[PDB]
């Protein structure tokens, strides 16, 4: 739908060639599409939520879950783990 809309727009702007209308249509297209991608990523993919999860998991941002995993797997970690199924 975005392609059809902006294609009709550029078709209406074909007689001018290189004009400032072309540039402003480009700017509106870029702004709209960037806001749309940000919305889609934050809603359907939870971008900021993914960043928070990575910060809590890999960067150990959540001490509670880290302590939980430690008390869960301390027995296996203390034992030699040369063979891990």
């Amino acid at each position: 739908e975005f392609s059809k809309k902006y294609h009709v727009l550029y078709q209406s702007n074909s007689y001018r060639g290189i004009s400032t209308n072309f540039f402003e249509i480009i700017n509106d297209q870029y702004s709209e599409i960037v806001n749309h991608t940000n919305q889609i990523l934050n809603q359907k993919f939870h971008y900021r939520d993914v960043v928070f999860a990575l910060k809590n998991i890999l960067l150990m941002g959540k001490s509670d879950f880290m302590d939980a995993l430690i008390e869960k797997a301390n027995d296996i970690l203390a034992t030699p783990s040369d063979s891990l199924p």
Binding site: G61, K62, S63, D64, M66, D67, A68, I70, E71
Partner: protein, 453 residues
Amino acid sequence: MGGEIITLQAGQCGNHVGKFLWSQLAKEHAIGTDGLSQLPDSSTERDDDTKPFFRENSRNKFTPRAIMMDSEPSVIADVENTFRGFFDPRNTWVASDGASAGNSWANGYDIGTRNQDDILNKIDKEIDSTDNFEGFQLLHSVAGGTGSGLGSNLLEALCDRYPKKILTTYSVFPARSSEVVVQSYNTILALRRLIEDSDATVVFDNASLLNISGKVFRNPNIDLQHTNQLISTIISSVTNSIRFPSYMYSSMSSIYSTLIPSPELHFLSPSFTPFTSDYIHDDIAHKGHSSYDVMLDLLDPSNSLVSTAMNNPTYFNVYNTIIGNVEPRQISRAMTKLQQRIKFPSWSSSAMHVNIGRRSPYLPLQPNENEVSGMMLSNMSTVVNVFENACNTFDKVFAKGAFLNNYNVGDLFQSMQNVQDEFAESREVVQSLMEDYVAAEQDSYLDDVLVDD
């Protein structure tokens, strides 16, 4: 390393402070007085964690993991009627033994010894309802004789029944006693077991409680319920490190690691700024304080909940948990200023520790003047001063033996000689504890491991 903790209500004060603490927790976690979470169970994302203290049978109901123990069924029935469905009726212990036959520690110890099977069965059943357990939080109410005896009995049972669990305790001491001899004897007998078995003990002297309740509240008359509200808010603030886990302290064992330097020194001194969840909390936005001012107030004697007796006091483990929108630069400035204004033992280079907590998303947000509060806990020897006068009482009454016809019944020893010997042993134990605390105030304490290897 995080586990579930069960609350233990012993005595009338114990039950009252337990009721107040559970009401405060229901206020923080939006659970209310009905036991059903005031929030809809459709929102699964919760920054807090009620599991360490609330068992979840139905999705909207969170049963507080606590047992109600007392000899007076009136207060238990009152708390159950006010909190309809909130508490579990099967976890309410009264033993149907009637009213306490006096304020003797021996009476409570006997009523706990005889009905030990039922309370142990209830504790085991509650342990069966959980999987990851860490320890209990016992409320002594040592001002009462039956309450102190019951607390000592539970301590003497749980020390050997569960040695792998950390047992913290909360002893509330009165300011003035109508008959100082009986209350002093009960507190000494309970402190004997505290030194023997208890892993952590927080003292609560009622003098500072009355002073603060007269200062911050508008009413000059002080009611016991809103005074227990202070202790309940204190317990909620300290448990916030688990209910609302931070990124540094996430387990009660980890919290006590920086607070317990040795099993001997297990008595702490509390302090807290002007509260915000209490009854008369409207006169808090006129203070216009910062985090540095909050730390100063935490170090101020006017905000300590026990008898300060600050005569160059020696600190051993100074720690604090700050709840609210806290700034790191103010924290660094406050630490710089306090390290220049706090007496430390020269044998240890360990300074005070600062922790920052998070505010609940459902608690009423306060204005920018008292939006951030903090709690402080300092290991100080001056706590023995609270016992010193008490021992003084002992030291000036034990030469005759008054009120001996009341501690002879109930306990295993009906003779005067055996009770006298037990009291002398308890006095010797508390004397040795005071000697350990006064030796820890010296550098030769640590030099003892240097002189011999």
